[PDB]
Design an enzyme around this catalytic site. Structure first.
Site, mmCIF file in Angstrom:
data_model
loop_
_atom_site.group_PDB
_atom_site.id
_atom_site.type_symbol
_atom_site.label_atom_id
_atom_site.label_comp_id
_atom_site.label_asym_id
_atom_site.label_seq_id
_atom_site.Cartn_x
_atom_site.Cartn_y
_atom_site.Cartn_z
ATOM 1 N N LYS A 72 -8.832 3.502 0.056
ATOM 2 C CA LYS A 72 -8.024 3.915 1.216
ATOM 3 C C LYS A 72 -7.680 5.295 1.429
ATOM 4 C CE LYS A 72 -4.928 0.091 -0.319
ATOM 5 N NZ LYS A 72 -3.439 -0.398 -0.464
ATOM 6 N N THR A 78 0.969 -1.184 -0.206
ATOM 7 C CA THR A 78 0.028 -0.079 -0.067
ATOM 8 C C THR A 78 0.735 1.256 -0.107
ATOM 9 O OG1 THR A 78 -0.922 1.243 1.815
ATOM 10 C CG2 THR A 78 -0.392 -0.987 2.227
ATOM 11 N N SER A 127 4.436 0.797 2.588
ATOM 12 C CA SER A 127 5.649 0.105 2.016
ATOM 13 C C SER A 127 5.914 0.981 0.923
ATOM 14 C CB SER A 127 5.087 -1.236 2.112
ATOM 15 O OG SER A 127 4.358 -1.331 0.707
#
Lengths: 174, 174, 174, 174, 174, 174
Positions: free
Chosen positions: C33, C1, C124
């Site tokens: 998100k 993500t 990440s």
């Protein structure tokens, strides 16, 4: 760190080094690891966190006037609250405590040990001190203070976590 | 991060860099790690959360209000709750605090520490600063401010987690 | 993500990818998100569990009408409940939140970071996005949305845990 | 285990195998992993304890009674407590639930997830089923039931933790 | 440490060594690990804290006062709380207890165990004693006391954590 | 340890071994691992701590007169208290329980499994027993008791943690 305690003829002492270690570096060298408690009638030394020691000691005093100054009986109680109680149970420390009746270790495992001759040696450098203290106390007429000091210094030479700064509290009862 | 506090000729400082690291990369480059407290009488630096600070630095202030400017004590009371209060306990950090009186460190362990010469060097770059600070302080007439500065630069040069953004807070008194 | 946020001339955006990963397989590709909060005046993005995010965000709103919409002041409180409180303390998530006054990260460590130019890149793939976003924002006249998008896509090409599904919420205050 | 749900031509299914494994051996071979709920209107499958189910499937039912058949919401309220209620929290499982409206997964994390095409494939054999399901659904006119079936067989052939005992639950509506 | 209990010809004993070890060194050499209870009617030995004992051996006594000398039951009630009472739970140890009736072990797990022939051998040196005890008991007319003794010596010879300081407690009845 | 349960023509049995293992040594060989509960109408076997079993079983009985002796319904409740409740949740054990309506496993994971033919085999030696029990129950006219015994013995020959001491409780309902 190394806490040493010897007891000869109405003389009992407790001597610690003063090194505080963080990882592989010395954070502080003059840490006071030995202090008096209970109207100076009781001496003590500790391996570990100063604040934890402060906490554990205060409570110790508390248990003293609570049991007419009987070291052991008052000490065993502390061995209790220590493992049972929530907060205290978190504290990390090793207590060395002495008065004129006996010397003895106190830990969070509800253990209250009293070595062979009130000879206490705790802390990473503890064994080396014991080794020397044993030798001295059995082949010389030296005094508690002299042995404790000399032992602690030997400990400091051997143990990478013990320096040569000392703090000695004595108790004469002769 | 590196927090360096020095004290020479009625002058006390606290300096720090502004690097925050996440893994192997820099998140931010200008983190203010040295604030001021108690009606701009008491200076302080720190290593930890921007909030943890704002909570541990507010509480400290009031403690001073509860102990008439007397640093040490307020500090003693601070480190106290900080290891006692259920909530306050999770807060992680290293407060460097200095007033015209003295200067000391505080750890979540409840410890209140006064280093050898009011010389403070906490943080991963801590010891490299201590080294450079100790050198200068013992071989030159430089000022407390000049010290912390240069010590800090040396640090950021050695420490992979310390940069060259500074935040200095002085204090004159004599 | 990867959650990316750029801010140029009265235009601030937040863009995330939509990949959910379980072990080494993609569990879902269109994860939303990024969403709006507080009567659409506030945009947000999150790395982690959707339900945890939902929880943390609701509370965030709560702290907003509770502090007249002051992002930071209302945000720092959340940084609190998050580490202190029992339940919340369990939540695993990284919050990215922005309005017209400033953009900023929020984590369970009671940390409230606000990067160098309201340039946020978390998750990440965060660094790779930052890297690209930095390049673009300093060698082109492109807009927040354009950078965020282009950056996020670069992130998706580099980061094995970031796909190319986007969700962008914008806020124009010019 | 493998839970496969598919939806095509006013038909929704949920299929599952019946293998329960302990270490490297099969404990049971005919575990019913696909039940029915809400007065036989809502179908469901799952991976977890036979009881965890019976508690998470009873609660779900009532939630529907508290939200007039509206799947999603009851699901939203379910995943809610499931990550909030002290007790309910220890329950571990993956509920697959589908009604004539939609179909979705639920995780102890409180997440409510609607996969790409009401295609669900949870469990260690999950992705092998997804793969075979996706193939068929995109290259043949087969029925939702025929899909889940064949997808399931493919799974049990690849997955060492999935067998060939099935439990299919359909639903017609148009 | 090694605790050995034996029973032959209306005679029951409990013997133990006195070594306490910390890492690879001996802390104390004369730890009394075999006391006496219930108005010197019931004998007992143990492995654990000097305090844990003093708390688990006091409680046991009262339990006997609550079950007219009937060993077993008091033991049953003891092992009960010992695994139930929040506080009592942290206590770690292995009580060996024997009366003219029977003899058995007790573990923090709440278990009450009566070994094959009232033969008890707990502690790191346990099995070496069991072996020597079993040998003697099956191939010689030696007395219960002579057994435990010799068994104990054999143990301390094999066991690096067991020494040769003893503490024997007998009991005659016929 | 190995608990085996077979059920043929109005005859259902439960057989366990009696070995207790500590590390690599046998602490006790005649452990009773099978007992009757609920006015002898219910038989049970357990893998694990005797005291934990005692606890879990008592409660089981409790749930029985609480649900008119319905095994499953009363059993599922236990599967509950077990995972939910604080204390119980700590207990480590595997329950095997049978009456005349069905045999079945019970664990702390809120799982209540009922194998293919009421054929239960739990404990480290469980699989080997199952293997043999399966063979016997499908190629011979032997009885539950005969199979259980013979199976358990095979288990004891294979499994290093299962001895040959048996304890069988039977239930005839024919």
């Amino acid at each position: 760190t190394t806490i040493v305690s010897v007891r000869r003829n109405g003389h009992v002492v407790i001597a610690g080094d003063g090194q505080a270690t963080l990882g592989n570096t010395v954070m502080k060298g003059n840490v006071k690891k030995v202090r008096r408690l209970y109207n100076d009638k009781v001496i003590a030394g500790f391996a570990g966190g100063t604040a934890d020691a402060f906490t554990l000691f205060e409570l110790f005093e508390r248990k003293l006037e609570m049991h007419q100054g009987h070291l052991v009986k008052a000490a065993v109680e502390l061995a209790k609250d220590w493992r049972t109680d929530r907060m205290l149970r978190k504290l990390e420390a090793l207590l060395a405590v002495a008065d004129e009746t006996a010397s003895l270790i106190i830990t969070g495992n509800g253990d209250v040990v009293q070595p062979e001759n009130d000879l206490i040696a705790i802390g990473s450098g503890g064994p080396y001190a014991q080794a020397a203290a044993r030798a001295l106390l059995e082949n010389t007429e030296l005094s508690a203070r002299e042995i404790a000091e000399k032992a602690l210094d030997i400990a400091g030479d051997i143990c990478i976590y013990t320096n040569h700064f000392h703090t000695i509290e004595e108790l004469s009862y002769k």
